[PDB]
Amino acid sequence: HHSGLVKMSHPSGDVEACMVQVTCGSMTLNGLWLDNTVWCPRHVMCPADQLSDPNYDALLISMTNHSFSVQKHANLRVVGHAMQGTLLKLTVDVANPSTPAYTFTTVKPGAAFSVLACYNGRPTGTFTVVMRPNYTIKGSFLCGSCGSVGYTKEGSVINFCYMHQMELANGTHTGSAFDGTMYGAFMDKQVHQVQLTDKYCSVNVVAWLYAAILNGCAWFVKPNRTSVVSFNEWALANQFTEFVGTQSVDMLAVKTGVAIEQLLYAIQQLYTGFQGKQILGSTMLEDEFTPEDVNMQIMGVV
Amino acid sequence: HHSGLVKMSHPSGDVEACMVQVTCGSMTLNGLWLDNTVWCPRHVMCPADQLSDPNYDALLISMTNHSFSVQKHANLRVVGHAMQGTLLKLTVDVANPSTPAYTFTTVKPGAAFSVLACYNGRPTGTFTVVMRPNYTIKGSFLCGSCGSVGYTKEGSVINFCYMHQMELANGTHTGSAFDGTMYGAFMDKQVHQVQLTDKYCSVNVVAWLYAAILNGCAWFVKPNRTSVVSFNEWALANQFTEFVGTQSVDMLAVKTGVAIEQLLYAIQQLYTGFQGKQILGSTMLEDEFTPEDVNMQIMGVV
Ligand SMILES: *C(=O)[C@H](C[C@@H]1CCNC1=O)NC(=O)[C@H](CC(C)C)NC(=O)OC[C@@H]1C[C@H]1CCC
Ligand SMILES: *C(=O)[C@H](C[C@@H]1CCNC1=O)NC(=O)[C@H](CC(C)C)NC(=O)OC[C@@H]1C[C@H]1CCC
Numbered sequence: 001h002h003s004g005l006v007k008m009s010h011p012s013g014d015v016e017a018c019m020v021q022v023t024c025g026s027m028t029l030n031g032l033w034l035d036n037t038v039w040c041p042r043h044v045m046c047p048a049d050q051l052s053d054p055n056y057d058a059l060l061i062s063m064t065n066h067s068f069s070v071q072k073h074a075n076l077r078v079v080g081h082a083m084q085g086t087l088l089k090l091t092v093d094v095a096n097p098s099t100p101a102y103t104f105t106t107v108k109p110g111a112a113f114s115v116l117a118c119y120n121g122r123p124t125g126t127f128t129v130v131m132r133p134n135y136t137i138k139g140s141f142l143c144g145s146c147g148s149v150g151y152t153k154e155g156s157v158i159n160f161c162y163m164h165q166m167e168l169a170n171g172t173h174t175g176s177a178f179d180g181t182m183y184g185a186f187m188d189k190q191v192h193q194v195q196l197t198d199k200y201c202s203v204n205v206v207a208w209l210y211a212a213i214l215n216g217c218a219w220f221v222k223p224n225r226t227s228v229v230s231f232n233e234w235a236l237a238n239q240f241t242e243f244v245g246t247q248s249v250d251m252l253a254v255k256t257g258v259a260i261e262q263l264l265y266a267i268q269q270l271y272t273g274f275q276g277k278q279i280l281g282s283t284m285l286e287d288e289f290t291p292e293d294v295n296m297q298i299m300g301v302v
Numbered sequence: 303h304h305s306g307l308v309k310m311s312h313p314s315g316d317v318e319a320c321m322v323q324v325t326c327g328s329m330t331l332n333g334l335w336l337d338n339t340v341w342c343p344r345h346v347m348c349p350a351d352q353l354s355d356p357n358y359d360a361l362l363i364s365m366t367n368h369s370f371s372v373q374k375h376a377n378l379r380v381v382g383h384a385m386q387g388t389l390l391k392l393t394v395d396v397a398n399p400s401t402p403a404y405t406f407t408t409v410k411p412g413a414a415f416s417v418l419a420c421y422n423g424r425p426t427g428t429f430t431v432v433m434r435p436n437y438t439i440k441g442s443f444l445c446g447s448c449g450s451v452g453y454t455k456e457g458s459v460i461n462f463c464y465m466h467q468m469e470l471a472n473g474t475h476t477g478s479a480f481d482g483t484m485y486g487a488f489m490d491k492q493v494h495q496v497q498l499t500d501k502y503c504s505v506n507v508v509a510w511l512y513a514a515i516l517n518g519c520a521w522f523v524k525p526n527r528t529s530v531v532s533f534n535e536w537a538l539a540n541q542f543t544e545f546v547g548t549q550s551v552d553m554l555a556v557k558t559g560v561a562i563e564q565l566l567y568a569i570q571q572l573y574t575g576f577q578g579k580q581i582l583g584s585t586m587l588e589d590e591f592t593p594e595d596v597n598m599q600i601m602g603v604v
Contacts, residue, residue: 004443008428009311010427011314126313138308139306142602
């Protein structure tokens with residue numbers, strides 16, 4: 001039986017209309033054009049010989065407005081430039097007539113967002129990721145993808161949360177929030193960096209087990225229960241996130257009649273092993289679907 | 303190590319601009335507006351009391367142009383109506399000014415396409431599926447999603463291949479090509495229908511094993527080899543598709559230095575069991591990524 005779950009992204013058209021190419025010196029990547037502002041990673045200013053230890057303050061000082069070439073696939077004339085953290089803010093002489101309603105927000109571990117992967121200012125694909133507990137994402141990014149953006153959507157308002165910066169040695173990816181901070185402890189320098197341990201996102205595993213029940217698959221449900229406080233002690237010793245329930249999870253508990261604490265017990269047992277059984281076609285725990293995903297895709301509830 | 307593979311969809315903006323709502327009688331679903339034509343499922347004409355055995359020919363005869371209300375979220379006046387297989391072709395008085403370059407094609411088992419899930423003519427999400435060997439897709443569709451479209455893209459040309467019609471008893475989905483045929487032996491009637499067996503898509507499993515090698519994961523590669531002819535005999539007795547190599551697979555063989563026949567042998571052994579080992583984080587064969595996916599996402603080759 002098919003779960004009815006897929007990796008679902010927001011329709012990308014509103015964001016596609018905001019993507020531009022930014023070129024400075026020998027570097028070319030993508031930017032995001034909102035109102036009279038183009039956002040892009042600051043390493044567009046870096047020569048190749050300096051990607052491992054750029055002096056971004058001195059590079060910024062060395063640039064003029066004319067150093068930055070911005071093109072939509074129109075040329076946008078840059079009339080101001082500034083640095084915010086790991087991002088540049090370029091002011092351009094034309095306001096984007098296709099600027100959506102938007103905000104900037106930071107995404108939290110375990111939460112999902114949509115990514116528009118772009119090369120040379122041209123959108124090429126879209127996909128959805130969950131921010132991992134170690135502030136990486138398991139994406140699909142190649143050379144030239146920096147400045148690709150991640151976002152969520154509330155109503156007609158696009159909430160931009162991610163601008164792509166780099167790949168880590170283990171193949172995962174990270175980037176910046178639009179306040180200019182990098183996610184996690186990462187730095188926008190091309191050197192090897194410590195990577196914190198990833199963890200299973202407990203609240204998302206709970207969501208997936210609820211998805212299993214909603215699809216008629218509940219062999220792992222027993223009357224046994226583990227409290228949130230006890231689970232969270234256990235989680236710390238077993239590479240799980242601490243569980244924090246939400247109204248979205250509560251709706252799944254109501255719809256199925258299975259209590260959260262029953263599934264926290266199940267997770268503890270399933271972690272030791274599935275004993276040859278499958279859950280929604282898998283023999284390992286799944287933490288890449290959120291409670292909101294399950295509520296929306298299976299229950300039709302946004 | 304992260305594979306660098308994600309479920310990647312085409313940017314959806316070009317298709318979003320083509321979606322409309324179609325209402326007839328008591329039914330409302332989505333349509334696709336290209337030039338002066340709106341395509342939609344013919345069961346928009348059906349009353350609820352007749353969804354299990356509609357007489358579509360008599361329903362069509364009973365309709366006038368004014369029976370069909372088409373809205374973009376503009377009202378499009380219907381000036382002609384016709385039935386092609388399981389689809390209606392409504393002629394409207396306004397050509398879509400945002401009509402992309404497009405063709406209609408039929409997708410084949412194992413091939414991937416992008417879906418724009420729409421409700422009431424409003425795009426709500428996008429995802430990618432592979433057409434299964436039994437002509438179903440493992441999608442995410444709820445009431446009101448009919449008329450949602452699937453497509454591939456070659457250059458700037460959108461190749462529409464799927465218009466959503468129904469969910470099967472096992473939770474999978476199927477629909478129509480734009481020649482009006484349903485995929486497989488399915489009928490657009492709300493009754494239980496035979497479902498052919500699904501099968502592992504051998505060419506996609508081969509692609510995924512190549513993806514593993516490209517990521518440094520090659521423990522399953524041995525000098526042992528199975529020929530395509532011998533594998534295909536085996537496949538018939540073991541619920542695999544017969545393997546047909548392509549230039550896309552050949553590029554993966556060149557890049558990795560591992561022959562196709564080595565991976566056909568591997569598949570035979572892995573099917574009996576992974577013996578506790580993992581491949582790209584999985585303990586079962588993966589057939590939802592194509593050779594083209596691997597070439598594009600990992601090798602940057604379209
Ligand atoms: C920007 O387009 C690019 C995106 C990156 C390249 C390959 N896949 C990707 O997602 N970013 C970088 O190349 C980045 C630049 C620095 C100055 C932030 N460096 C980088 O990603 O290095 C990748 C290799 C694995 C790491 C080894 C030590 C850093
Ligand atoms: C059209 O919006 C709708 C889409 C379907 C509903 C729930 N999830 C979906 O993808 N299509 C139908 O409802 C379809 C109409 C007929 C006339 C083609 N019927 C249908 O999908 O039935 C679903 C239930 C499982 C099957 C049982 C016997 C048919």
